[PDB]
């Protein structure tokens, strides 16, 4: 019993973190096989960041200008290329701790663990969600760039995020491991504003299921609703529309608790309309939306 | 910027987790050097748990009755002893991944990371606090016993907790690594009720400092208070008394923000008395008390 904002064990990713220095810029890289992946803004001065031409800045850079340090041992860079907003540095040594891995581009609402790193060294691990506006609400100081987000399926690390940017509002933007930004963001020090940070409705419902499973039941009501009726109220509260696909995904949690998905929608509708009245659910005074249905099943079943 | 409930990177502890089986009971052990530490209730049937005599149950157990598996390789048990509520199993192989480590007994209000494990395998990592009633609010399913709590100082893992028990209220109890329970709890399936779960005042103040550092400032008021005046209001709201020792500990956060500790106490006093009025602080609708002053400094400075 109990339900915690839980990250994946980080060891498999700790074994991939290196330091990348180009001139006076230091950030983190991800060493998988004989490639080190890092944000391409490693080549920029903060002056360059105001309006960088990355192809032009890269002409001035050779293999030997990219200083890669794994623990306190230097890796020899034998190649470099730009792919979208990441640099791939070919090194002469395969990472011996390379886990089974994939690169995935996640959808908004999907959750992942972040291993916050400085100078190629792990500082901490926390759980994030890709917001519907393609930001994440992270904890990232200067030097944290190249920190990665990941999911683990048994022995396979799926890398879904690399940290690049803080917006002036202090929310975070980054790329998949192909170097494509999530959302419309660019690796330039210019005015970039996030869109509406809507609530991930299917995640709130999963977490309400998690609450019922863990004995928190006060909010269960005598009502049901329809997707269309629910969605009219959802829109009013800046909640994402609920689709039949989301209902299908919540099926196993419905089965386990015996609470029809649309019944739990009607409970959520009343919580939105009435508020919490000073009550808590799983120790939160607001509706949590950074647990996926898959996260709730995983934590509630003890997957390793 | 941003402030997250962040755990220590877990890799160093992942390398210590093993499976311990005695008869039909399986749980987790911690392998450090040539010793495996696990809850002594590994020797119990759930029938035994109603009123176990551990010394008598242990007479029936030999080295070869303790099945220790590290990854999918069996360790040879060459010795066993009971220390308080833990068993120490001497194995013929030093754990090659043994980190620098210490055993510490933490105080209430102190935070630590938990690596939740099943069958000696890591499922996830999350941040906890030792509650003032010496429970923790964990996420622990059957099989999670022997999961450990820890802090890391650079390269040294300080192990402070081993999971033993869920109270009927679904809160958690356990021991330090000497096998001494935190609080009055016993490893027996009997009515054990937790005392008052008070709020860790010094931790709330640290987190209010964290909020100011990260741009959340709406709750800063025009008032100050005294420790005695603050404490009269604290007691009314089931907050722990604030001592001069806590004021001293918050000194660096005071210095960094220029907000006198007693000024921040007066802000907290108004938040207790007025509530949040539907507002949030660092994305919480309640006052967070599972960040220590040391945690806020660490996360705000990016220690590795
Ligand atoms: C992103 C991580 C860019 N890197 C930095 O800003 C570095 N800052 C610190 C404090 O490490 C800088 C040395 O390049
Ligand atoms: C504490 C972890 C005691 N262990 C258990 O209850 C085990 N349960 C599961 C599901 O692993 C049992 C096999 O001994």
Swiss-Prot record, chains A, B:
Cytoplasmic compartment segments: 1-304
Listed result of changing residue 49 to A: Does not affect ability to cleave and inactivate human TRMT1
Activity regulation comment: Inhibited by pyridone-containing alpha-ketoamides compounds 13a and 13b. In turn, alpha-ketoamide 13b (tert-butyl (1-((S)-1-(((S)-4-(benzylamino)-3,4-dioxo-1-((S)-2-oxopyrrolidin-3-yl)butan-2-yl)amino)-3-cyclopropyl-1-oxopropan-2-yl)-2-oxo-1,2-dihydropyridin-3-yl)carbamate) inhibits SARS-CoV-2 replication in human lung cells. Inhibited ex vivo by michael acceptor inhibitor N3. Inhibited ex vivo by compound 11a and 11b.
Positions of crosslink type Glycyl lysine isopeptide (Lys-Gly) (interchain with G-Cter in ubiquitin): 5, 90
Domain Peptidase C30, chain residue ranges per copy: 1-304
Catalytic activity: TSAVLQ-|-SGFRK-NH2 and SGVTFQ-|-GKFKK the two peptides corresponding to the two self-cleavage sites of the SARS 3C-like proteinase are the two most reactive peptide substrates. The enzyme exhibits a strong preference for substrates containing Gln at P1 position and Leu at P2 position
Active site, renumbered: 41, 145
Compartments (UniProt record): Host cytoplasm; Host Golgi apparatus; Host nucleus
Described function: Cleaves the C-terminus of replicase polyprotein at 11 sites. Recognizes substrates containing the core sequence [ILMVF]-Q-|-[SGACN]. Cleaves and inactivates human TRMT1, preventing tRNA guanine(26)-dimethylation of tRNAs. May cleave human NLRP1 in lung epithelial cells, thereby activating the NLRP1 inflammasome pathway. May cleave human GSDMD, triggering alternative GSDME-mediated epithelial cell death upon activation of the NLRP1 inflammasome, which may enhance the release interleukins 1B, 6, 16 and 18. Also able to bind an ADP-ribose-1''-phosphate (ADRP).
Complexes and interactors: 3CL-PRO exists as monomer and homodimer. Only the homodimer shows catalytic activity. Interacts with host FBXO22; this interaction promotes the proteasomal degradation of nsp5.
Protein name listed in UniProt: 3C-like proteinase nsp5
Annotated organism of origin: Severe acute respiratory syndrome coronavirus 2 (2019-nCoV)
Name of encoding gene: rep
Included stretch of the parent chain: 3264 to 3567 of 7096
